[PDB]
Structure 1
Amino acid sequence: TADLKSLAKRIYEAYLKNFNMNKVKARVILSGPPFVIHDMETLCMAEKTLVAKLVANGIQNKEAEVRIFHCCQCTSVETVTELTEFAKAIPGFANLDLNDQVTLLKYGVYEAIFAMLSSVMNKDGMLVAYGNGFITREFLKSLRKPFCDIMEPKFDFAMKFNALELDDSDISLFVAAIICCGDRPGLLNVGHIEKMQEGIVHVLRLHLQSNHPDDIFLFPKLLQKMADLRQLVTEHAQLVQIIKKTESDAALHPLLQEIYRDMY
């Protein structure tokens, strides 16, 4: 159908326009020159070049694990802004009640964040700082608990997600499907959201048939990844709560505090 073929392109176009990183761009960088962060020496070097404001305090600077945690949060905050503008190209999203738009983004942003993080991850590490650094997975594993425990589950998810070999045309529809879940708690107009979601899911199913004819199960596999991402976020929010309670130096950004507030 031409209207559905266009809906898929509108959403893909909105994705390419609103996210600073996409999978084609990430793959070009990941092939090879981002500065490699693989130990404490190179973390401190990268900090002086890529985030110099943070380490300009002398002995007042925070422990390395907490600086990394802060920089991960700053990355998330940026992605929430990108996700918020992308959400307007989903048909009917801007016609939803303003409160419903807030609730959908509230529960969807971290599922979308972890899905899209896969695009900049490989089995050895991930791009950081707008593509200018690459931090190794082994370095992130080396951080003291509980900060190391934030990281590896996201790689575990991404390695299996990346094995599906989706492209940006697929992932844009997937992220839109994540944002339009009609079973989020607190929704006012559930019925309208379900019809909005059904239209996107309908385009996602047809698109996957067209773009991945070799994988007859790809649509139900992606439905399962959405459920897996919900569980990943529930687990992530618990671990973030442990850090907030037990690490007095690891302040939560206020935008992320509101996202987490009464989430799970």
Structure 2
Amino acid sequence: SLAKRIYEAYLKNFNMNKVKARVILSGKNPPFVIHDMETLCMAEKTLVAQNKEAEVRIFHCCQCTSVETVTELTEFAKAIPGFANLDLNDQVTLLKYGVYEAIFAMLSSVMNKDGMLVAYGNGFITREFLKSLRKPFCDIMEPKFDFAMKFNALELDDSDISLFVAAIICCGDRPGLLNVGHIEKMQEGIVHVLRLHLQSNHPDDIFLFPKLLQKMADLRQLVTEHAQLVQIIKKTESDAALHPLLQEIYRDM
């Protein structure tokens, strides 16, 4: 019963998932392609309700995306059996260290080799246009594309991803955790049903599970590096104000 409840919590709480992303990325109001600054402003005229630099505008749209995903992950976590029973400070700790690992995992679902869906599926910005931006904004998304290409080569579906994200959140070695024994047992259950699910769902890949353990470690490193870019921007970029929720997450991480 654990696997089904987690998959349903994922379907209930994330506005965007892999099935919906592929349905959009294939056609069937097709996405407006943002490949240069002229198509950027055109998309912003049609979609967004600024005079700031375009890099700062893409920056503020990305963080609003992250704030909304953090809200979705919080509701998702509360639906993980056993999560709500933890001390409130333990739930905060799990979310604080878990959300960006989950975010970059789930971001892979909207990414291909050419770019990524944006604006709740209404736009598609190209990998090259993000590289064409001025430093340091050009260096933010490329490591996430690199991770996503290798992650997407595993060909997970939403049922696999939902259990994987639950395992990320329910991680007993986060700094400052009080009830480490209870959380470790929660994780052991999630990982157990994840392993059974990978065997049933991917019988062709008997090594899928250790592959995914490595992805959890790569994600931790991807987020550690990302947090360093956040601090660079908080210190050295004029108009790049950071959302208070996100600064609280990155603070002391």
- Give the TM-score, by structure 2 length: 0.98
User: Alpha-carbon deviation of 1:51?
Assistant: 1.0
Secondary structure class of the residue paired with 1:135: strand
- SS of the aligned residue for 2:124 comes to strand
The aligned length equals 251
Deviation at 1:244, TM superposition (A): 1.3
Give 1:91 shift: 1.6
Q: How many angstroms apart in 2 are the aligned matches of 1:194 and 1:90?
A: 14
Distance in 2 separating the partners of 1:114 and 1:162: 12
Q: Equivalent residue for 1:57?
A: none
Deviations 1:105-129 (A, max 9, x none): 0000000000000000000000001
Residue by residue over 1:15-55, the C-alpha shift from the partner in whole angstroms, topping out at 9 and shown as x without a partner, is 011000010000010011011111000110111111127xx
| C-alpha deviation, 1:90, in angstroms | 1.4
CA distance in 1, matches of 2:71, 2:46: 24
**Residue 199 of structure 1 is aligned with which of 189, 212, 230?**
189
SS where residue 183 of structure 1 aligns? coil
Query: Alpha-carbon deviation of 1:249?
Result: 1.1
Residue 8 of structure 2 corresponds to 13
Aligned partner of 2:37 in structure 1 is 40
Unaligned runs of 5+ in 2: none
Helix, strand or coil: the match of 2:140?
helix
Question: Matched residues in 1 for 2:154 and 2:232: separation?
Answer: 33
Counterpart check, 1:24 vs 2:19: yes
Per-residue deviation at 1:243?
1.3
The separation in 2 between residues aligned to 1:220 and 1:89, in whole angstroms, is 26
Query: What does residue range 34-113 of structure 1 map to in structure 2 within 5 Å?
Result: 34-52=31-49, 61-113=51-103
**4+ residue runs of structure 1 moved beyond 6 angstroms?**
none
CA distance in 1, matches of 2:123, 2:26: 13
Q: How far apart are 1:169 and its partner, in Å? A: 0.2
Decide which moves more: 187-196 or 88-97. Answer: 88-97
Please give the alpha-carbon distance, in whole angstroms, between the structure 1 residues aligned to 2:110 and 2:192: 27
SS of match in other structure, 1:256: helix
**Residue 235 (structure 1) shift:** 0.2
What is the distance in 1 between the residues matched to 2:223 and 2:190? 22
Structure 1 Cα separation of the partners of residues 166 and 74 of structure 2: 11
Deviation of 1:203 (Å): 0.6
- Looking at structure 2, the residues matched to 236 and 223 of structure 1 have their Cα atoms a distance apart, in angstroms, of 20
- Give the CA deviation at 1:248: 1.6
For 1:128 and 1:158, the matched residues in 2 are separated by 16
Secondary structure of 1:126 counterpart: strand
Q: How far apart are the structure 1 equivalents of 2:100 and 2:249?
A: 9
Q: Which runs of 5+ in 1 are unaligned?
A: 1-5, 54-60
Q: Following TM superposition, by how much is the alpha carbon of 1:89 offset from its aligned partner in structure 2, in angstroms? A: 2.0
Residues in 1 aligned to 2:238 and 2:176: alpha-carbon distance in whole angstroms: 32
C-alpha deviation, 1:166, in angstroms: 0.1
Identity of aligned residues (%): 100
Structural RMSD (CA): 0.8
In structure 2, C-alpha distance between the alignment counterparts of 1:246 and 1:150, rounded to whole Å: 15
Q: 2: distance between equivalents of 1:106 and 1:79?
A: 13
Partner residue in 2 for 1:239: 229
Alpha-carbon distance in 1 for matches of 2:96, 2:252: 10
